[PDB]
Design a protein around this ligand. Structure first.
Ligand SMILES: Nc1nc(=O)c2ncn([C@H]3C[C@H](O)[C@@H](CO)O3)c2[nH]1
Ligand SMILES: Nc1nc(=O)c2ncn([C@H]3C[C@H](O)[C@@H](CO)O3)c2[nH]1
Ligand SMILES: Nc1nc(=O)c2ncn([C@H]3C[C@H](O)[C@@H](CO)O3)c2[nH]1
Lengths: 262, 262, 262
């Protein structure tokens, strides 16, 4: 039961961190791992394998960590190593950290990702608030009659707060596609016609899970590349990571500043 | 085998109803349950659990009913309680009532749903004939080489007939999305660009199954809300049901009048 | 493991054909089976059931063949009988022949299909190079962190080469949908707004698999019908096959000429 394992994850967190309430959570996207040191000093580092429900039962492999990091007046659960739908596991594992985090008291999820830039003004290394998404996975992490209203899925308030920290932060619609392949240029023209400014392979489920769980969502894309076909520059995951690395100190400091304003 | 269980469901129906041919079938959408009393007097009430193939093997729970209701010169199988793709069961259970109904002689499926209104003229409580759909689930209830031509999936004739009953019935394209989450406003702008007038979480599979089974389809959406972001009014399932309730007497009477014209 | 069975398929091929490297592969689409005799003389005919990984474990049935055909200075693996996603088997079986073929040395995949024509100039019996695709299946045949850049998924060079053979070959964006149902006219207007010139039920996975495997892709659609609603002419699979048959000699000769230019 996802809610059960989430509650049980949250007991482990509170137990092992000594912290009954982590007020905020962050999921670090592709390339955002080096941003951790910029976020602050982890006080607890929890192997995700030690937390109920974080690891898909099968396809074994050394999952990442959940950090408890004091950021301003918040204990923040920071997810380092996430599961993506394209790994082929149930979405419950994709969104488990949001649910676990919510069970541990997280009222804000900061959902970060690497994204391809579609909108003309967006440039590589530029962080972009997600104002909205297009879930183009044909999936939901919610599994029977759980309506969730997705109006303001990406809290305008958290965005204003984000902008108080960085007033020039652009915002954009993010299209979540399954991946793990990147888009054809024709897909990218499609996405633009669909109203996407950003394209990625995560986030949408986590946002939906977050909202269903009663949490607010700040989405932040790091534009790591302009989306396929826009310039002709070939996309690569190693370019996405390297872009995230080159931008990671700034991204961490951005998040720390923004999260402290929450 | 879906066709087998459908044939076997149809034997149960004919046996328990005493009616060899139900000429029409109705699937009642979200909120349309109170419309039953408006449809007429059920002569037989069949627990869906007593009909082969209606209940997904696992995820147990007290399924609904299939009513045999005389409506005009028709015995009409009326599905009260339906299964939605978002329940996570195979689409065969989503569309089993259409197939069962077709096996019991249904030549017309009346597929009703609650939908969010996208088109400018559509208002809450307004019934809307489905002129067509966008199946945006990336799925089909058909499972190997079963081509079905979906040209006129929503019989223009049944629509004209529907309009003979209610000449001001608008019509619209319905986008079937998986749910169970409602759309982001950005998704709703996407859908509009895609040509949808209505958005929901059912119908498309049933229509496809219906057409594959050789049956005609009248789709009717009750607009229960304007789609996300159009007004800013938050979407809720309880608003969808309450809208369906407020509109249910009319909807039942509409369907009874329309079905008798068939 | 798809790569393992692919390598093992390739050993079988090299063993049974006596040919260590098949430089090219062709997947024949719906209706393209009669084009085989036009392609050349098969030197080996391999039941797909005798090749590791070609047949889905369950849903048994007499799969087709993989032909080794000398075409110009190439040994070409020609897939006769393919698996489509709509058969409900894992995509690994959909794309196994591309992977097997790549393991047997194929550097070019020629991916042929029947498609519905959306673009105004496209006519029935007209072959159309795929310049790009819209993967509208919400799926990928790649299964964990396998980025594949899909920029130039359909090699412009192979297209120019194709055009050296037939300078009037049009090109078009192909939208791969799951099927097996054909589109509603509203879906077809959607697809056009999305930038599709052609619509089908295959190819996109094979292209993605091909590219992931390091192979170049020539896509060729035979326009078998104008897409749903464009003319009103009802779509049928038997029309698709008959169109493919009427056009098969030409299509085979086209492919033979084009493949020899590779
Ligand atoms: N879909 C998609 N298109 C892009 O151009 C793109 N650029 C970066 N990313 C993100 C998403 C993943 O975190 C990770 C993909 O491995 O990087 C992208 N995703
Ligand atoms: N997807 C979607 N968007 C809406 O705005 C909307 N409004 C009503 N409905 C319908 C569909 C289901 O029967 C049921 C959702 O629980 O109500 C909607 N479905
Ligand atoms: N989706 C779709 N729409 C069409 O109008 C259409 N016309 C031909 N085809 C192709 C695809 C399959 O090979 C096969 C469908 O059985 O024929 C189509 N596919």
């Amino acid at each position: 039961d996802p809610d059960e394992l989430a509650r049980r994850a949250a007991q482990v967190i509170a137990d092992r961190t000594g912290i009954g309430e982590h007020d905020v959570a962050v999921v670090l996207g592709s390339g955002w791992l080096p941003a951790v040191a910029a976020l602050g000093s982890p006080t607890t580092v929890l192997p995700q394998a030690e937390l109920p429900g974080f690891v898909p039962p099968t396809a074994a492999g050394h999952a990442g960590e959940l950090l408890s990091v004091p950021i301003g007046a918040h204990r923040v659960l920071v997810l380092a190593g996430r599961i993506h739908a394209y790994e082929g596991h149930d979405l419950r594992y994709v969104v488990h950290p949001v649910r676990a985090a919510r069970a541990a008291g997280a009222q804000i999820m900061v959902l970060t990702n690497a994204a391809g830039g579609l909108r003309a003004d967006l440039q590589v290394g530029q962080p972009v608030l997600i104002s909205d998404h297009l879930n183009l996975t044909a999936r939901s992490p919610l599994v029977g009659g759980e309506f969730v209203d997705l109006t303001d899925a990406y809290s305008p308030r958290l965005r204003e707060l984000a902008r108080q920290s960085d007033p020039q932060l652009a915002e954009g619609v993010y299209a979540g596609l399954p991946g793990p392949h990147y888009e054809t240029p024709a897909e990218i023209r499609m996405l633009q016609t669909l109203g996407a400014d950003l394209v990625g392979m995560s986030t949408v489920h986590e946002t939906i899970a977050a909202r269903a769980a009663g949490a607010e969502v700040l989405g932040v894309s790091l534009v790591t590349n302009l989306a396929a076909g826009i310039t002709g520059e070939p996309l690569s995951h190693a370019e996405v990571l390297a872009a995230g690395a080159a931008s990671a100190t700034r991204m961490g400091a951005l998040l720390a500043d923004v999260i402290a304003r929450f």
